[PDB]
Every structure is written in structure tokens, then in C-alpha cells.
């Protein structure tokens, strides 16, 4: 109570903090919430707004919610070079099984030939609410370095099924 909910494992032995994709603009939408007991297995499918069929960002964010201080690592990879077919498709499912020991067994399944990449991923908890808030000072102001990547989200938000995904390592600099 008092707004502060943001870890809770006792009477949740679930998917310990909520995690799923760092999104548009330096927010969080979790992919798996906790709720779902491990072993857990669930579907979501999605595509992106830019580069459909090339590159998806694999950066797994287990962290709150809206305010992006979200920034649990449960990753940072991409799921690149899926053939030439940039913006909409929509079809790439999305799968994502934890074990019952605590690893993200998620498979970004392609729907181009199937190119997919499980990773297995760590998920352990051991953390605080103001690991989030201690991180909303730190690193919710070092949500403006993300809002330069906000102008290369394109800026927008929600992204239900549209997800911006692209790396960038250019040889000049």
C-alpha cells in the first residue's frame, strides 16, 4: 500500500518483477507479468513499425511499467537479418516459456522461414521497488540520453504489436 507494489514474491511464486521488451521512447511493457506461476508458457505475437523482417531488438526488460527506471536487464541482443520486408507484416510470434527453475525460454519465432532465436535468459529477483525508483533518480534522468534514442524510436508510445527495432554501428564516427 501507499503505491509501492513493485516487487512482490511470497505469495507469488510467478515471473518475479514482470518482463518483457524495453519499448518506444524509454518505456517499459512488460511480456510476462508476475500472476503467471513458473512454469509458465505464453503467446504474444508481434512486429515492428520500421524493419519488420530484419531486425527485432531482443533487450528484455524486467523492470514496472510506464516510468522507465524499468531497466532490469533480462537482456540486450537483437534477432537480425530476417530477409528484405521492412515495416508491417504483421507476423512474427513471440513465445516466451519460463521453466520452473527460472529461465526465460524465449523463442522469437519469425514468420518468414521460421528464423527464430531462443534465448534462455535469467530472471532472478533480488532486488527493490527503488532499485526501480533508486533507479527513476539515476537513471530516470538518464531517460533523456533515451529520449535521443526517442528520436530514433521515431517517437510515438503504446506499441501494441508495432515495436521500433533497430541497431545502429555505423563505421564512421
Do not use: Y
Not at 63 to 78: T, Y
Amino acid at each position: 500500500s501507499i503505491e509501492g507494489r513493485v516487487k512482490d514474491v511470497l505469495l507469488l511464486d510467478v515471473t518475479p518483477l514482470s518482463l518483457g521488451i524495453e519499448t518506444m521512447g524509454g518505456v517499459m511493457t512488460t511480456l510476462i507479468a508476475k500472476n503467471t506461476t513458473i512454469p509458465t508458457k505464453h503467446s504474444q505475437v508481434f512486429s515492428t513499425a520500421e524493419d519488420n523482417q530484419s531486425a527485432v531488438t531482443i533487450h528484455v526488460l524486467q523492470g514496472e511499467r510506464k516510468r522507465a527506471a524499468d531497466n532490469k536487464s533480462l537482456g540486450q541482443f537483437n534477432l537480425d537479418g530476417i530477409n528484405p520486408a521492412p515495416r508491417g507484416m504483421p507476423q512474427i510470434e513471440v513465445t516466451f516459456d519460463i521453466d520452473a527453475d527460472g529461465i526465460l525460454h524465449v523463442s522469437a519465432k519469425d514468420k518468414n522461414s521460421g528464423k527464430e532465436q531462443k534465448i534462455t535468459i535469467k530472471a532472478s529477483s533480488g532486488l527493490n521497488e527503488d532499485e526501480i525508483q533508486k533507479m527513476v533518480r539515476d537513471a530516470e534522468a538518464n531517460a533523456e540520453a533515451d529520449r535521443k534514442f526517442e528520436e530514433l524510436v521515431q517517437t510515438r508510445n503504446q506499441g501494441d504489436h508495432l515495436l521500433h527495432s533497430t541497431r545502429k554501428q555505423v563505421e564512421e564516427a
